Design a protein around this nucleic acid. Sequence first.
RNA 1: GUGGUAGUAGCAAAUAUUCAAAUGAGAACUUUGAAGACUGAAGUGGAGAAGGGUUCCAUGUGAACAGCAAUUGGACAUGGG
RNA 2: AUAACCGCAUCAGGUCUCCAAGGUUAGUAGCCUCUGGUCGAUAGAAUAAGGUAGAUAAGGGAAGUCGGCAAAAUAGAUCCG
Lengths: 62, 369, 158, 107, 63
Amino acid sequence: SLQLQKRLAASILKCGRRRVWMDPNEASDISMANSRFSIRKLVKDNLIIRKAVAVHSRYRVR
Amino acid sequence: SHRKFERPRHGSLGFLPRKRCKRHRGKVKAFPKDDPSKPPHLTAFMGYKAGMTHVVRELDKGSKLHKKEIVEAVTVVDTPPMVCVGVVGYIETPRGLRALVTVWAGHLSDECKRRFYKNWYKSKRKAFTKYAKRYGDKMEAELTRMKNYCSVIRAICHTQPSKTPIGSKKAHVMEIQVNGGSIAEKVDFCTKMFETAVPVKAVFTEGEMIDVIGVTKGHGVKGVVSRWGVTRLPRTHRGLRKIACIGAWHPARVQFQVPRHGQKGYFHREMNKKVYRVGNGAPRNATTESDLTEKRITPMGGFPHGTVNNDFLLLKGCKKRPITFRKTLVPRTTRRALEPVNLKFIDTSGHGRFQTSEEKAKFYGPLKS
Amino acid sequence: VKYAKESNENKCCKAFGQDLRVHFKNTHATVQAIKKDKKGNPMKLSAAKKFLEDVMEKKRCVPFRKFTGCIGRKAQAKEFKHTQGRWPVKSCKFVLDLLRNAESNAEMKNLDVDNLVIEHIQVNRAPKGRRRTYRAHGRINPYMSQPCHIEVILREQE
Amino acid sequence: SLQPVCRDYTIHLHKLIHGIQFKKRAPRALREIRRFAQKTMHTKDVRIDTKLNKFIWSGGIRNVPRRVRVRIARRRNDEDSKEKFYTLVQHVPVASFENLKTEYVNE
Amino acid sequence: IKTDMCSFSEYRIYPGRGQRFVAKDGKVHTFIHRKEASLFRQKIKPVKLHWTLVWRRMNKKGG
RNA sequence: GUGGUAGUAGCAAAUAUUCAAAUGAGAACUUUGAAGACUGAAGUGGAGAAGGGUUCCAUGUGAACAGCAAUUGGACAUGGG
RNA sequence: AUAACCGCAUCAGGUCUCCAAGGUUAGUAGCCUCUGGUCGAUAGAAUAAGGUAGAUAAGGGAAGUCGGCAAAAUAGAUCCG
């Protein structure tokens, strides 16, 4: 599992769990990161990223 | 207590039990009786069911439809010529009939020979190979038996389903009885047919009642309602596509006359169905006196489930079934039978407008490539 | 641990399964297929491996002779002159694992693994397992496992 | 005596997934594509790319596409799990399906 | 042989086919097919359907 | 205490899963990605009370338990809060 | 709380309070969506009878039945009446 990391990322990214993204090819490095301090460094590297929210236009309404 | 309102029975007890029969072609049962008087002729045939289409003919009956133009539904049956092979004597014993000796031909095709194997692709195909060298070294020992003894004689014929557009090849073997005079001349009739194709015009004619044998089209396990024709129960706990009361208390047993759930279709089963047209595969089959336009009795886009380019016969089971026909057990004259047939128009048009494909091309004109 | 039989050894080897979590009635069926060939002779071990691997593929099948009600009729059981049959996969796994161990025991005693023959396989019932099934109206009903014991004894032919 | 082969097909999916339930169309697409590849190239292990999966599910699970082009590569198997070949199946992006036969694919 | 024609679509009806709706006054409207009849129920006319031989004729197509 | 019934009744409400890679003795079921769905703010969302009492958190695992499976777990064990 | 409470259980049941987005609309109705949440409910193959729920039926229109039971038909808004 990673599990802990998607939980802890979601607190520090201030985003819904649905939103958090974790890099598939660095599943070795992310599983090392247990702490909050460790997951902050993975945000700087961009292995853990926040997804943009789903597109919801007002064009057709207007 | 008695019934209340005395209705008739659901279904006949004549046909029972209602179970799929052990045979894919119709077995004949009961050939017609011998007149030592007629010349020797065959009394049956085999053919494949195709599809049915309507035809227009002028009635010759004082009905109100005298001299009027009636449409009628009509089945095409594909009948390529049945090749005679063998011949079979039959002693009459007090037990029953009993086969004395089967004689066979010299040279059977691979069409006939497939019948004797369940796996043709594996086998070294040995059937009638010891017999063929024995034949060249023929059987006028064993034919002398059939002339001396034996009240009844039957030609073994077989089909040619490579010529049909079924993917078959296997070919049904079939006994057909010979009804004419003199037990010697029945064998001389059979002997000279060996490795000769018997066509359909040898047997049957335009304007003739034929008794049609076959197997009904299967529906699997169907319930009481469809299977026996029973009243549907009113809108009933548990369910309503079923009988309510099987039986009275006594007898303390379910009777065989009560209808149950089970098999429907694939039953071996008619009589007096008139032949309208004997045809030829060799153009203008569907052409008549009236219309005078060049046609084959294939409709456009085939018979659905295809072609037919053989001899056929029209007349008044599922598609691709082997029907057998029979010559009627007494030659009967009912005005309805012994009728002048006159075909004005045979239809060769999902929902077809046009009779021929060149007629369609005229209507739509130069289409876009 | 207490076998039912006991070749003076030297020429024979054995393996035991103490209490496997499988169905007894399904293992009973596999073991009756393995025990002999179509003739009366005892079956070779190379044949019974090649059988049990094919039953997992569902190409050969196991005939259910004793415990029949209500097993569906398959064409693959024509092999055994018997209409009913079935492909018990988890049962074939534990029996393959035991014969795997029985050939391993033969390799210490140094005889031909290629010539080995199944002298005696037998299944016993084992002590029951307890569970609860809940019924309507507050009733509680037992749900129970039926693990089984599997003996195997092999030997050389000739 | 099999050897590694790559070749191309088009699968009539409308034909495969006929009379089948509306919440099993897109799953029972990919079972029958797996069984097709498995039967065609005689191989147990059949990997199928995510861009084939993606195309099939574009429909939404009931409105599956009528035709797909698909090329199917049997290839040599690391220390092998039993069988020493694996099949693998890929989407081919194609504008129209008008006379495209079961062709070979050169490397 | 002789071939009466459809009221709606102006096609030909070879015999053993179609259907003759008799109206309230008693104009015998012949049809080929259920396509024709069930648009005569709805009272959509031949002139507005493009496939029909009537719209064909009036907009410089055919003949 | 143990049978026959019987490898039988049955495991069918709450729209739904699929493909790949990683982990592992073992993957329809664990995790990560990519697609596709549902809930549709008087929500299956975010917080309290009653009632529960360590179920919270981490690391580890031979059974049993989680009506298939299980590398998972409100299970089991050792710590912490 | 469709698994930490109570119903013998990880039981389609029950249990007080707060916050409450967009489109359609009179509307916290129904229908679709964004944030947040979830895919937890044993699977695969065939498509018999009989069921469970859901649809549709030419002509006739309660003749069915203890009885129009069930299902159809009507439905919003504006103007007239």
